[PDB]
Specification:
alpha+beta; Arc Repressor Mutant, subunit A; four-stranded antiparallel β-sheet; Transcription factor ETV6
C-alpha cells in the first residue's frame, strides 16, 4: 500500500482479521479493547510488515509504552497482554502519533 501502518495501526488490521487472532484479538472491538494472544507471533507480523529481522515483542512493547504517553493505547489493571485503545486512529492521528509515523517507519 501507500500508507504504512504503525504498530497500533497494524494491530487494528490484525485485530479485524481472524488469521491473526492467534497472535492478537479484539476483546472488545467497540470498546477498542484487544488482547495480544501470541505476542511472539504478533511481533513476527510486525517485523513482517516493516520487513525487519530484529523485530521482537520487546520492540513492539516499546511502541506500546510510547503509545500510552501519546494518548493512543492504554494498559489495563491485572491482565497480561490486554490493551485498550485510549483513542481511535482518527483521534490518534490528530498529532498524537504524528511523531510516531517517523520512528515506526523502521
Amino acid at each position: 500500500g501507500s500508507h504504512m501502518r504503525l504498530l497500533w495501526d497494524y494491530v487494528y488490521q490484525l485485530l479485524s482479521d481472524s488469521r491473526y487472532e492467534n497472535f492478537i484479538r479484539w476483546e472488545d472491538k467497540e470498546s477498542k479493547i484487544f488482547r495480544i494472544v501470541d505476542p511472539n507471533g504478533l511481533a513476527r507480523l510486525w517485523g513482517n510488515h516493516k520487513n525487519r529481522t530484529n523485530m521482537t515483542y520487546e520492540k513492539m512493547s516499546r511502541a506500546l509504552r510510547h503509545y500510552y504517553k501519546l494518548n493512543i493505547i492504554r494498559k489495563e489493571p491485572g491482565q497480561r497482554l490486554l490493551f485498550r485503545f485510549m483513542k481511535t486512529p482518527d483521534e490518534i492521528m490528530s498529532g498524537r502519533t504524528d511523531r510516531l509515523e517517523h520512528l515506526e517507519s523502521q
